[PDB]
Each structure stands twice: as structure tokens, then as C-alpha cells.
Amino acid sequence: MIKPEMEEVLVKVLKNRWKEHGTPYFDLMTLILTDLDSYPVWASLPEYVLQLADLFWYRPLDIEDEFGLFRSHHDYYPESPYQTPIYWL
Amino acid sequence: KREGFAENGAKAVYDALKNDRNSYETRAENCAKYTIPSLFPKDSDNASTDYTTPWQAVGARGLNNLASKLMLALFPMQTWMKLTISEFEAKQLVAQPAELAKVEEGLSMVERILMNYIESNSYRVTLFETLKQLVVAGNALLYIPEPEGAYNPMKLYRLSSYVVQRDAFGTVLQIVTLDKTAYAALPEDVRNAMDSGQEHKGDEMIDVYTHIYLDEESGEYLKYEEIDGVEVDGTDASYPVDACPYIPVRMVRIDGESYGRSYCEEYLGDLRSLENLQEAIVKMSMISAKVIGLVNPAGITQVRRLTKAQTGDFVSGRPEDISFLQLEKAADFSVAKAVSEQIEGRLSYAFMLNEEIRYVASELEDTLGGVYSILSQELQLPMVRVLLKQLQATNQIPELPKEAVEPTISTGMEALGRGQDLDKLERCIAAWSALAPM
């Protein structure tokens, strides 16, 4: 029911690149990348969710450090097709 | 000029104590090799050797599972601590409900500030890493920084980077850390301090030594830092024995030792045997020179055409009705598989990959309750003490009466009526309704 407002928030986050703990909206963005209740966003605005995942997952140069990934990675620990929005995107 | 333990310099104490550490290091290396080698890599010839991937996955999976459960007893999202009021002081304060209200509003908001500081500084991450180190090497060291900026997570040390010395009661007498960073990366005054001697290259790594040692004319530990046998000016500090910011931790307690032991030391023979059997099964598959199969529906499709001497002819059939015996045909396969099942039974029980009283509490409460309580002593209590003193020194929390207000950990079990209503029911409905078809 609030697609224009959600889009405005996502545009602002991608413009300012607020990808770090303590910056604005960081908690809600984390949920959009991790939580199944976020599926109306995944259905309504997928082109923005892909850009958000690109911003939040990759860290340019444990084996995570060699792949170039952030150590909050155990949010996905029991690895499964339902851990990420990709199956619905 | 220094006095006491510091008389000969931090590097001298490090090189002197290093001799005793080699056995504990060797044990940690052997435990890492059969679980996850990047937890304690110590091979030199990595141009020629890898962080060698085992065929058995059991060690890595068991280590991760155990660390997760220990990080559910320790440091959960629910309230695991209590700022108590001493009963003699409570007996004074209770004379007016207003005094208790003013004290306990302070205690409520300070306790919420402690859980805030734990989560807002993401201590959960480094504490999970620490539990991995404790399971594989038995030993770890943590440091809590003085606050600067907006965000302040801890620093974690592996056994190969520090030394520690203890009395017969386990009391820490002194600690030294060895730290490294390149010349050009160090602070400006530090870079100016090394004008004499050799001409440093910009990327030349400098060995810095931190020495912490106990005082006698004061109830304090003393700190300084050292390069090339000379003190780094301005790095000196002092701390009372009740609130030092350095915390060395042991998995299993022993008297008369600087160090603890790891859990999986008892099971290294099993892991080393399981790998041996799996490698044999691979080679047993590779060498085979004949293939055997079966057609399932009672022979209704006529295979005699294959017994005739013609290569260009085909049986009517499907992948739905044909199978092959590519491992199971081999003679020694079944017994190698059976022994592997016995070894995995012991390992899976050990890593917890499993009359009206429930007996699972023997492991889930009594077995874990020991290491849970010992980490309450040697890890949780020093951390909350340092945190309280730091928050007070940085004016974040009030200077509530020192004789009355005292910390405590409430190890045990959390409330359950909320838990089923949220996790068993509504989180399940959310997942189920999200997963429904298009």
C-alpha cells in the first residue's frame, strides 16, 4: 500500500550509499535483504532490491575474506534456497 | 628505567615465555588440520601446500554447530544479567518507595544501556569468533577499547600472538602481545620516533610489543608499549585489578598452568581414522573395470537383443526403470561404510549433532552448564565490570552508589509463553504464507 514512499526511501539510500552500521535506514534495509516478511517489496520493486544487494553484499579486496564478503555472513548460516530474496526475484 | 616484571623489556619477556607455548600451539594446529585449517594456519610452505581440504566434512560441521549452541547459552537476546542491590543497603533504601523508585529507574535504564551497548557495538560477532577459537585451541585473548567515535567493537587475539604467566591460584601476573604494522602506516610521531638506526622501507613491518604487568605498591596493573627495545612515549597507563581491559580466557581450567586445553583433543584419532577410510573408498571407486546394473519392471522389456552380437540395437526403456551398482558392487565397501558409521556416531554425539523428568537436560543443562558458568566467571563478569566503569568514565551512565549496586549473571532458561506464540506460531505463518504459490 505504500509503494511510492518505499521507492523514495530506496532511491535516497542508493544515492547516498548508506551501507554501514549507524547510518540512516540501515535496520530496514537489512530486513529487506534477510526476512521473508519483505516479500511484498520483492514483488513490487525488484529492480531496486538487486541494486541494494549489490551495494550491501560485496567488499572489494576465514574464506569469506578471500571471496571479498562481510563477516555478518552468518545471517545465512544454515545454507538453503530460502536464505535470500533470489528465489523470488 | 623500569622496575619489577618490566625490568628487562617487553620483547625479552615475550621471547622468554615463548618456549612454554609450543606444545599448546602444536595441539591447536593438529585440531585445526582436521576441522577448518584457516582457524589456526601454521604451515610455513604454503607455496607448496594448501589449507588442505579433507574428504570428511564432519569436523567443520560439528565445530560450527557447537559454537552456535554455546552462543545461545552465552549472550542471547534475552536478559542474562542483573544489577543487584545489596541487602544491607536495600534495608536502608526501602524506608521510602521514592528512593527505591529513583534508584531502580536508574538501574533499569542502565541495564538497558548495557544490552544496548552489547548489540549496538555488535559484540555478538566477535564473541562467536572467540567461541570458535576456544573450541579448537582452548585459549583466547580479548581487548575492550577506550571509547572513540560512534562504534566500538572489540579486538580478538589468537594464541600465537601473545604470552601469559600465572600463579598457583590461576592469577595473571603478566601478559605480552606481539603486534605488527608497516612503517609508513604508523602514526606520525611514531614514524618520527624511528629516525635513528636503519633506514626503514615504507612497507617494512614493525614488531610492536605491549606489556601488561602487576604492581606491588599499588593494587594495579601497569601498561606500556615497546619497539626495538625502547618505549613508545605516551603509551603508558594504569588499571585497577578489578577492571583491566585485557581478558585472557580458558576453555578447560587447570591449576599450575598458564593455559587451557581444547575439547576435540580427545577425538583426534577418530577424525584421523574417518579421513583414511573415505580416501580408500574414493580409490576403490576409481580402479573398477566392469559395470553391473538392473532393469526393474520384472523383465517386461526384452533384453535378449543385448545378448545378441549386435551393437546397433536398442532396448525400450527409461531412466525411470534402470539402475547401476557402481560403488555397492565392491567387496570391501560395505564394511568400510559400516566402520565409518560407528566413528560418525561417536563424533556426532560429541559435537551434539543429535519417570517424568526429561533426560536431555543432562547434556543441554548439566554438561553445558559447567563451561557456561566457567565462561561466566572468566569472560562475562570481567566484561560487564569493564563496561560499567567505561560508561561511567565517559559520562554515559550515572555514578550510582558503589556499596549498593553490584553486577551478576543469571544463567539458566528463558520464559516460554511468548516463545511459542512468536517463534512456533507467527513466524511459521509468515514463512508459510510467503512461500505459497504464485
Side-chain angles (χ1 to χ4, degrees):
Chain A
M1 305 287 341
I2 62 158
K3 178 183 177 185
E5 296 78 19
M6 257 306 204
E7 166 170 16
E8 181 163 28
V9 171
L10 287 165
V11 165
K12 211 182 324 312
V13 169
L14 295 171
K15 183 187 298 290
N16 290 275
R17 305 233 334 170
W18 291 322
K19 73 181 186 287
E20 301 194 310
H21 203 122
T23 62
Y25 305 103
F26 178 82
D27 306 288
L28 185 65
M29 292 324 152
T30 299
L31 297 178
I32 290 167
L33 296 179
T34 278
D35 198 6
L36 283 87
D37 299 56
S38 316
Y39 84 91
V41 189
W42 308 339
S44 304
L45 296 174
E47 305 85 359
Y48 294 98
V49 180
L50 292 170
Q51 295 172 75
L52 186 70
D54 184 56
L55 174 67
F56 271 64
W57 290 344
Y58 187 53
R59 181 67 273 280
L61 299 184
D62 315 59
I63 202 170
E64 298 157 24
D65 300 347
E66 314 305 348
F67 285 114
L69 302 172
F70 298 99
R71 285 189 171 242
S72 304
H73 167 239
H74 301 81
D75 289 343
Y76 311 113
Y77 164 52
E79 78 295 334
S80 155
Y82 308 137
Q83 284 291 359
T84 62
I86 295 295
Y87 184 65
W88 294 272
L89 295 174
Chain B
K1 188 65 179 288
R2 289 286 169 178
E3 181 58 283
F5 295 107
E7 176 173 28
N8 299 302
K11 184 173 184 179
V13 173
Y14 192 91
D15 289 345
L17 265 275
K18 179 184 177 186
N19 183 72
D20 194 34
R21 205 179 65 190
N22 289 294
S23 55
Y24 290 95
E25 287 183 46
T26 303
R27 291 169 178 155
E29 296 165 39
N30 292 339
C31 298
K33 182 160 60 176
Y34 290 93
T35 54
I36 301 176
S38 58
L39 295 177
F40 206 90
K42 212 70 178 71
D43 290 319
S44 304
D45 64 5
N46 304 292
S48 73
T49 55
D50 54 352
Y51 294 165
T52 309
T53 297
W55 294 110
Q56 62 86 9
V58 180
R61 199 172 295 160
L63 187 156
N64 279 286
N65 193 283
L66 178 60
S68 304
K69 292 182 182 181
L70 292 170
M71 182 68 157
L72 226 36
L74 297 161
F75 317 156
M77 278 286 327
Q78 323 295 17
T79 302
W80 56 265
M81 82 236 82
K82 184 48 51 191
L83 295 183
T84 65
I85 302 177
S86 177
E87 285 70 23
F88 180 73
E89 296 297 307
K91 284 171 179 184
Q92 295 162 73
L93 271 46
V94 70
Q96 294 187 350
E99 291 196 58
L100 287 175
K102 290 291 182 180
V103 170
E104 296 201 81
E105 187 278 333
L107 254 47
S108 303
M109 71 103 172
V110 174
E111 283 182 330
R112 207 224 47 52
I113 285 162
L114 293 175
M115 283 194 134
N116 160 347
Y117 206 83
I118 289 156
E119 294 302 336
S120 298
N121 298 280
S122 68
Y123 277 16
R124 300 285 286 279
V125 175
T126 291
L127 293 164
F128 182 82
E129 305 287 27
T130 305
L131 287 167
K132 286 161 54 188
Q133 287 294 321
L134 289 168
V135 169
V136 79
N139 298 274
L141 166 68
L142 282 168
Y143 169 73
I144 296 166
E146 93 294 26
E148 296 187 48
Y151 172 67
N152 270 347
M154 281 175 306
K155 183 164 63 186
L156 172 63
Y157 280 95
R158 294 180 180 175
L159 179 63
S160 56
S161 302
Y162 77 93
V163 293
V164 65
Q165 188 174 14
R166 278 180 153 109
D167 75 6
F169 308 110
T171 324
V172 174
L173 303 178
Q174 59 175 344
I175 297 162
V176 188
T177 78
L178 166 59
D179 317 328
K180 288 185 180 181
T181 285
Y183 165 64
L186 290 167
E188 177 61 17
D189 77 351
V190 174
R191 293 188 301 222
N192 281 258
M194 55 220 282
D195 285 350
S196 299
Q198 303 84 1
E199 300 299 340
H200 290 310
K201 299 175 183 177
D203 57 83
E204 176 71 329
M205 302 327 225
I206 308 303
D207 48 325
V208 188
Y209 303 82
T210 317
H211 192 178
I212 305 95
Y213 66 101
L214 184 59
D215 199 10
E216 296 295 343
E217 296 78 17
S218 188
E220 288 178 298
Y221 290 95
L222 305 178
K223 167 178 179 276
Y224 83 100
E225 296 161 42
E226 185 177 289
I227 294 174
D228 209 306
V230 180
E231 304 194 20
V232 187
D233 295 307
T235 64
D236 53 298
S238 309
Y239 313 99
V241 169
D242 295 338
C244 182
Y246 292 88
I247 304 168
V249 188
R250 300 174 293 182
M251 197 64 183
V252 54
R253 185 179 292 163
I254 296 180
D255 294 349
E257 288 289 324
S258 284
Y259 297 115
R261 299 287 286 275
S262 63
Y263 173 46
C264 53
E265 157 62 14
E266 299 175 33
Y267 297 96
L268 180 62
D270 275 353
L271 290 165
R272 188 157 57 203
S273 301
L274 185 64
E275 181 67 0
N276 190 283
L277 290 168
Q278 288 299 125
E279 186 166 43
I281 290 170
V282 171
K283 293 173 66 172
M284 179 201 315
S285 184
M286 281 187 314
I287 201 62
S288 184
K290 106 159 82 173
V291 52
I292 296 187
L294 173 141
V295 53
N296 183 57
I300 69 178
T301 181
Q302 242 296 13
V303 303
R304 298 329 100 71
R305 73 188 80 192
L306 306 182
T307 298
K308 302 301 300 292
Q310 179 164 343
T311 304
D313 204 2
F314 316 106
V315 152
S316 180
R318 288 67 44 170
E320 303 301 318
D321 40 62
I322 300 297
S323 68
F324 301 95
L325 304 313
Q326 307 293 31
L327 266 170
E328 280 289 326
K329 186 266 181 183
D332 302 312
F333 173 68
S334 58
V335 297
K337 190 166 118 273
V339 172
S340 304
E341 297 291 350
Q342 292 185 351
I343 298 168
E344 288 191 56
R346 294 195 294 270
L347 293 171
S348 59
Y349 208 25
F351 286 114
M352 308 172 42
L353 295 168
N354 299 316
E355 299 180 32
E356 298 298 325
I357 290 170
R358 218 175 300 72
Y359 286 110
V360 296
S362 180
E363 198 77 336
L364 303 183
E365 305 297 335
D366 189 46
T367 297
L368 294 183
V371 296
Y372 184 14
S373 185
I374 271 58
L375 295 170
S376 307
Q377 305 267 99
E378 284 259 71
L379 172 63
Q380 300 184 275
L381 296 177
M383 204 178 317
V384 301
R385 281 193 264 107
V386 173
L387 269 275
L388 285 167
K389 295 239 145 33
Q390 216 60 329
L391 291 165
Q392 284 182 333
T394 55
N395 307 317
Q396 155 41 46
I397 67 176
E399 301 287 6
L400 303 179
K402 299 179 181 178
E403 302 281 28
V405 181
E406 298 185 325
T408 288
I409 290 87
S410 53
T411 61
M413 224 177 165
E414 171 56 338
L416 300 178
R418 178 184 172 274
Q420 61 209 283
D421 187 53
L422 205 172
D423 294 315
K424 191 189 297 187
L425 195 283
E426 283 283 16
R427 200 97 244 171
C428 183
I429 295 163
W432 165 83
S433 57
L435 187 56
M438 89 225 69

